[PDB]
Amino acid sequence: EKKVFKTEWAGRSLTIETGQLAKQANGAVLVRYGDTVVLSTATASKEPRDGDFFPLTVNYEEKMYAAGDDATLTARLIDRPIRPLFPKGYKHDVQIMNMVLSADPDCSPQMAAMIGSSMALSVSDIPFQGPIAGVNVGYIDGKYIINPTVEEKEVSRLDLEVAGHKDAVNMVEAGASEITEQEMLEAIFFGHEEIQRLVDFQQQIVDHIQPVKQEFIPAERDEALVERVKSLTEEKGLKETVLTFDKQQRDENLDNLKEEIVNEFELLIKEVYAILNELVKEEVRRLIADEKIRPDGRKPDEIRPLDSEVGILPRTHGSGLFTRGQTQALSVLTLGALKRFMHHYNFPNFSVGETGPVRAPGRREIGHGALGERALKYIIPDTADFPYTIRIVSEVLESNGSSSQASICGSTLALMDAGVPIKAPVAGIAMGLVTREDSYTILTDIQGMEDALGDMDFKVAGTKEGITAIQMDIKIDGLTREIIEEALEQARRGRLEIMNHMLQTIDQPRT
Amino acid sequence: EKKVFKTEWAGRSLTIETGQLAKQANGAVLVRYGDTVVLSTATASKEPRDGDFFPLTVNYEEKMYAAGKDDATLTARLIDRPIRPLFPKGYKHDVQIMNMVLSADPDCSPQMAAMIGSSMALSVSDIPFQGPIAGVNVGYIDGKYIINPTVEEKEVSRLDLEVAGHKDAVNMVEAGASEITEQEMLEAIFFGHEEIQRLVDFQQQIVDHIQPVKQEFIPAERDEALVERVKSLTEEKGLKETVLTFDKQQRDENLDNLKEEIVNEFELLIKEVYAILNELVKEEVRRLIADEKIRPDGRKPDEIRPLDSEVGILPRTHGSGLFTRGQTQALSVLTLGALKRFMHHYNFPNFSVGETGPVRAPGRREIGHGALGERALKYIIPDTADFPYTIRIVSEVLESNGSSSQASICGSTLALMDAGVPIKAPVAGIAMGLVTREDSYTILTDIQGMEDALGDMDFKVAGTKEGITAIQMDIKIDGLTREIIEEALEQARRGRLEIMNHMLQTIDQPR
Amino acid sequence: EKKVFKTEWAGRSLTIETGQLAKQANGAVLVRYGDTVVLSTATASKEPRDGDFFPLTVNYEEKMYAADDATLTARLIDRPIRPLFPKGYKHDVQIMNMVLSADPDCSPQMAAMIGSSMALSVSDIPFQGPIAGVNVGYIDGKYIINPTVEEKEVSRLDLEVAGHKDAVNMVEAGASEITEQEMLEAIFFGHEEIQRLVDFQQQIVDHIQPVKQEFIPAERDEALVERVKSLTEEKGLKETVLTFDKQQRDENLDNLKEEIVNEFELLIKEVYAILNELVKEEVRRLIADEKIRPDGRKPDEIRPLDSEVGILPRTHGSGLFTRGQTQALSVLTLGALKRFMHHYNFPNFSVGETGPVRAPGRREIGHGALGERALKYIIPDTADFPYTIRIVSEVLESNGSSSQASICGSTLALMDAGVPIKAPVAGIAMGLVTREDSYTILTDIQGMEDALGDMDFKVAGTKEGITAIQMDIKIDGLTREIIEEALEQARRGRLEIMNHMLQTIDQPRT
């Protein structure tokens, strides 16, 4: 029952095989892209899990014979464009595995696996709303190039990975040599045209295989029950509760507010909690679109209050503390004799007022560390005029916003503190989004609740001259070109404000 | 209250001490065999665990100081095998058995000392174990069998066998061999068992002296009438035809559903109905085989599942083989290197059985099957003298219903030929099964998961056309007679020969 | 809202900052002590956990850039902090300490200990401190606080004392065979500084004026207690307690409770709790009033002893030591040429239990190092005995003090092996029952006496003097007389034990 479908992808062949391998998986496909081979599978639990949480996991692993954080980064990469495309309220366990059986570094295993994963879900009976595809873009002598080779990347000014579906982009994640907003936005959409071909090719396959999807019947809310709950919510001043300034106190009051409504009033309880969460969600979203005020009283373009300090640790080579609202990071730098530069990120439970077991670095901590390292490596001096190794470790002492971005600001402080002759300071911020069908509002410097109840989390970092790194994921089907362009601009402003503050603290590398 | 009991075991002393050490354990014994010393203990939970599953664990560990300076996992699995089937049916207490090698003379097998240690500890305990059991190592030099050969005799034996069992029968065999005949193996087995019988004899005297007081296991007796009701609702809903569903996942789905309905008729009463259902399923399968001579995928006791294979499916790897037998499938990949010298690993992902779950480090089972594979193969691997390269093979189980471990041996033989390794001879393997009715027994060839689970044994044999290179067998009944054993070996010789025949269509000699 | 409070601590500055860092923690403080910096935090779960168990965790970690020990340090800090929470308070509390900068002359361990006290004291968590801790050395007859690295090279004592305003809470020490009075003085020299440190923390609390959360302890239903206390008297609780065999005692007690409860859900939780206190009381009463412990011993009698040497053929040295239902086997390996270490392993079968086997836990790492500390002082100079020495101790049974049994075991193994050691070493664990009328000190305690008693005070050393201590308590504090009496009675105890040990082997093999 083996079926082979073939095409071209940036000057080398792309083959997708199904029906032969891993047939107990809900769906499974083998991807040959040049000399790169990847087996991708998608499996779902039999019945759906309880509670309001969608367990979705993506793994990636490169076999020893195919030729250690990269695998974790890659798996996080593939999760991003796939996660938002499941019917709302679908809470089956879904696990997606990718095994790189053969790896030609000129033919991206990361991108092969991403398409592999899309295909495996698309042939499966799992109700995924793709296909999706992803692509790598470089930028050499003013020309964009798809899936550049190892040697072209040595020379590109951009290392971008874009992904999305038929009608829109889903995810971007990038590192760059300080390139303009418009250079980036063009790269994005050059990338998306190829994405569109790739999706096209996957749909023909789906049209040929004609898989039978499982039927997800989403329940329709009881108009009347909503109405009752929506009254007990209005009487107890939900609006004013939401507008509590302090993070922990806001969450405490909301919990309590819900904690009371539910006691009115088991399967009926599950509903009331769910109705409550949407009513909270709506209130927050309404306040922003209609009254232009966020739940800590800010306006869509205002950044949180900023504080910073340098040299706070006696014996360390460099040290920086950066505080933006209820998010705070301490970054520490060590120099060494003579991989050459790295940045780690640690997120303790106390940072969010929580108790729990202490572990080895998790997936998220590994992500943010590398994001930080990516944003910064472009401004680190040449080994030729500064022969030392540089390690930076960032500790998140408090968190409500973007620890990862705060750590980039922290680390820039530490680098200057330490007297590292860097190209230019770097700062970063995270952008948010509320869409109403009438229109959208872009939010600057978002807090946790805005990520959680918003539509995107779009992190941009770079210098005054331009962008050094991006990482973006979303919780709606797609982002239009004008929303991306606007976000980049408003993030350019945001970062500029932040570098301005940072230079009050230290205005150049120590001597 | 120290008591010392003494005897001879293959030309060296064997002493068993109890009453002094580890007296809070339900039972505990110290074993001195030559200069080897092992402390063995057996402990049971106070009350029995819930559900229909017998938690039994065996550990083995060799201290750092034991020599005056994966094997432990293999050894612990070895000791579990003959011990597990000998507990009263329905006994579901946690039982844990620990073995500590305090001193280790490699000429006096710590593995065997521990195995007898473990039997003794349970036998003196109040845990209702139905032994004793004992185990022995057999070599084969210039046509003579030898018990517990020394290191230097093993350098020269044609057989490395570990046999075990009780008073009246053999329980377990596990072996590696230089391509020896079926009768040469069966004799070794029963030479081994005569010594086993002495060892059991010696343990029984001890038990007769210590006179331990066992805990009283009252097995419930089934309600004749309730069985009858359930057995009708099962007959009306076509259990027989349900069982005969061809597709593995679909068979399990329908059976679950069938049970899923009967139970809803209809809490402590539910536990019973589920248990009654499982036995009725068990009986139907067993009946179909003994009486109608058809297995639940419609095969007959001697037919092997449909076979497919391929070589060279991975571009850049030195050797590559894909082997498919029914709904079980394995991909084996080979890497060559400069210059421990040969190894084989085995990986079993969850998707192989259509499951979701967390990915882990190699488990116990995966370590077992890997080594079983490596054992079956090492005998046919060339001398380092005429082929100076290291050889690693990794086998991935992409689907599973039968014997992954045997499929991986077939896969690896393909990969070795693919890679151009001048091997002695191809090797294949299979797993044999067994249904006993009191009237008579049927031996099953190439069993599927359900046949292992509801059958009486799982008897894996692998080797060349000239003879056997490896065995591993465990059982779920009290013992295996000599005629069954012999018949199984013969029918497994046929089975393997069929498989090598197919394999040679794919590749008929080393590339 | 940054606030900085400053003082002197043994000739160097001590600064405590709050209000700036880690403000989502219930409380948090930064400690600068010389060039050492430590951030300490204290966080509590929102609501209290179910069941009768207080989850309290302390972590400690020294960053890579700051320049088993971390586990030892974290266990150190837990000890004086644990007993000072209101009885029945069962919130998760976690306490973290991060050494951001570490000057080994200014103890990060002590900075963190005060850090942890401060973080709780500024928090809304109802901790009953402050507490503080201090290091004492002993050079040419003079005690010194927080000696530097180079002074420790030359001290005869490495002591860490801690406690609160009115009493000492915890001691843990290693020593070059020093007398009981020499130790007890060091302890109380240490406590005067502790008192300054607590004083300084109290002013801070008086300045910050934190608002504590209100812990309302329920009051027992006099009448329900009375009913339960009758069903307990009728079924012979007293006689049940006096069962000799450990497992059998626990089995009967479980069963006894198992019956009373069935009389008789939220009401059940109460009956179980009432039962546990009635058991607790019976045991305590028997000791104070009848002077008999629940295995029939008297407050000063040690359990029956047995020992053996050379039980393993091929190992360089081997010792088996049994004291009551606690038993340890210690094994020694010699090597070419960190130089001495002792490990401790505690399998589940040792207590008749089943469970998963793991990497060495926290407790096992503690006891191993306690053992190693007690012994290193008597191990020969590398000059006249050029070999590495590893000893591993296995606890085959346990009811008492495995850690002390392992020290006895290891001394046996060292002699067995022919190691020319300074002198044998033995150890024991002391216990305590306080009634408001008076107290009884218990020698060589069993598990139940630790669990239902007021302290667990382990002392080990030679005939000439003490080599190691480790003590924690379950009451607010220990007076000086109790701590002096315990040391003396532990000196006697150990002497008995060395006496027995020398019957087995009276000098290093030759």
PDB file of C-alpha atoms in Angstrom, chain A residues 368-441:
ATOM      1  CA  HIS A 368      14.410  31.376  26.319  1.00  0.00           C
ATOM      2  CA  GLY A 369      18.102  30.874  26.928  1.00  0.00           C
ATOM      3  CA  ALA A 370      18.765  30.286  23.258  1.00  0.00           C
ATOM      4  CA  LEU A 371      16.468  33.163  22.195  1.00  0.00           C
ATOM      5  CA  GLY A 372      18.548  35.375  24.457  1.00  0.00           C
ATOM      6  CA  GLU A 373      21.789  34.016  23.080  1.00  0.00           C
ATOM      7  CA  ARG A 374      20.497  34.546  19.541  1.00  0.00           C
ATOM      8  CA  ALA A 375      19.511  38.201  20.113  1.00  0.00           C
ATOM      9  CA  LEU A 376      22.966  38.933  21.570  1.00  0.00           C
ATOM     10  CA  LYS A 377      25.527  37.017  19.543  1.00  0.00           C
ATOM     11  CA  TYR A 378      25.339  39.487  16.637  1.00  0.00           C
ATOM     12  CA  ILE A 379      26.694  42.358  18.803  1.00  0.00           C
ATOM     13  CA  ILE A 380      29.460  40.386  20.518  1.00  0.00           C
ATOM     14  CA  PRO A 381      32.971  41.354  19.478  1.00  0.00           C
ATOM     15  CA  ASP A 382      35.200  39.450  17.158  1.00  0.00           C
ATOM     16  CA  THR A 383      37.456  37.005  18.965  1.00  0.00           C
ATOM     17  CA  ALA A 384      40.327  38.827  17.228  1.00  0.00           C
ATOM     18  CA  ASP A 385      40.032  42.100  19.178  1.00  0.00           C
ATOM     19  CA  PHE A 386      38.601  40.500  22.378  1.00  0.00           C
ATOM     20  CA  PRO A 387      40.110  37.049  23.146  1.00  0.00           C
ATOM     21  CA  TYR A 388      37.907  35.837  25.995  1.00  0.00           C
ATOM     22  CA  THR A 389      35.057  33.425  26.417  1.00  0.00           C
ATOM     23  CA  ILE A 390      31.814  34.985  27.605  1.00  0.00           C
ATOM     24  CA  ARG A 391      29.146  33.201  29.637  1.00  0.00           C
ATOM     25  CA  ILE A 392      26.073  34.973  30.822  1.00  0.00           C
ATOM     26  CA  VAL A 393      23.443  33.509  33.094  1.00  0.00           C
ATOM     27  CA  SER A 394      20.121  35.240  33.657  1.00  0.00           C
ATOM     28  CA  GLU A 395      17.921  34.657  36.665  1.00  0.00           C
ATOM     29  CA  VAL A 396      14.311  35.576  36.643  1.00  0.00           C
ATOM     30  CA  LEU A 397      13.528  36.869  40.144  1.00  0.00           C
ATOM     31  CA  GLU A 398      10.017  37.938  39.258  1.00  0.00           C
ATOM     32  CA  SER A 399       7.804  37.367  36.304  1.00  0.00           C
ATOM     33  CA  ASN A 400       4.676  38.715  34.733  1.00  0.00           C
ATOM     34  CA  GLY A 401       5.743  39.694  31.246  1.00  0.00           C
ATOM     35  CA  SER A 402       8.683  38.737  29.221  1.00  0.00           C
ATOM     36  CA  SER A 403      11.432  37.288  31.259  1.00  0.00           C
ATOM     37  CA  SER A 404      13.166  36.352  28.034  1.00  0.00           C
ATOM     38  CA  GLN A 405      13.190  39.952  26.837  1.00  0.00           C
ATOM     39  CA  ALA A 406      14.122  41.260  30.309  1.00  0.00           C
ATOM     40  CA  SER A 407      17.071  38.846  30.248  1.00  0.00           C
ATOM     41  CA  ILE A 408      18.293  40.298  26.977  1.00  0.00           C
ATOM     42  CA  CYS A 409      18.147  43.775  28.557  1.00  0.00           C
ATOM     43  CA  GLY A 410      19.841  42.432  31.686  1.00  0.00           C
ATOM     44  CA  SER A 411      22.605  40.828  29.662  1.00  0.00           C
ATOM     45  CA  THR A 412      23.285  43.945  27.652  1.00  0.00           C
ATOM     46  CA  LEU A 413      23.743  45.765  30.973  1.00  0.00           C
ATOM     47  CA  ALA A 414      26.104  43.061  32.213  1.00  0.00           C
ATOM     48  CA  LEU A 415      28.172  43.184  29.008  1.00  0.00           C
ATOM     49  CA  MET A 416      28.653  46.941  29.343  1.00  0.00           C
ATOM     50  CA  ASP A 417      29.320  46.599  33.088  1.00  0.00           C
ATOM     51  CA  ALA A 418      31.979  44.039  32.267  1.00  0.00           C
ATOM     52  CA  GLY A 419      33.682  46.291  29.723  1.00  0.00           C
ATOM     53  CA  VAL A 420      33.014  44.079  26.704  1.00  0.00           C
ATOM     54  CA  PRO A 421      33.535  46.162  23.557  1.00  0.00           C
ATOM     55  CA  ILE A 422      30.201  45.251  22.005  1.00  0.00           C
ATOM     56  CA  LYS A 423      28.862  46.453  18.653  1.00  0.00           C
ATOM     57  CA  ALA A 424      25.798  48.075  20.216  1.00  0.00           C
ATOM     58  CA  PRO A 425      23.375  47.604  23.089  1.00  0.00           C
ATOM     59  CA  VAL A 426      20.412  45.313  22.475  1.00  0.00           C
ATOM     60  CA  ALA A 427      16.944  45.380  23.979  1.00  0.00           C
ATOM     61  CA  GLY A 428      13.739  43.533  23.345  1.00  0.00           C
ATOM     62  CA  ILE A 429      10.071  43.489  24.017  1.00  0.00           C
ATOM     63  CA  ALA A 430       7.013  41.414  23.470  1.00  0.00           C
ATOM     64  CA  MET A 431       3.965  42.542  21.430  1.00  0.00           C
ATOM     65  CA  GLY A 432       0.373  41.427  21.866  1.00  0.00           C
ATOM     66  CA  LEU A 433      -2.898  41.547  20.006  1.00  0.00           C
ATOM     67  CA  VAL A 434      -6.623  41.643  20.547  1.00  0.00           C
ATOM     68  CA  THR A 435      -8.795  41.107  17.466  1.00  0.00           C
ATOM     69  CA  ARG A 436     -12.407  41.979  17.380  1.00  0.00           C
ATOM     70  CA  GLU A 437     -14.215  41.406  14.105  1.00  0.00           C
ATOM     71  CA  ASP A 438     -14.655  45.181  13.793  1.00  0.00           C
ATOM     72  CA  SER A 439     -10.915  45.760  14.290  1.00  0.00           C
ATOM     73  CA  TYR A 440      -7.721  44.929  16.140  1.00  0.00           C
ATOM     74  CA  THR A 441      -5.538  46.578  18.781  1.00  0.00           C
TER      75      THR A 441
END
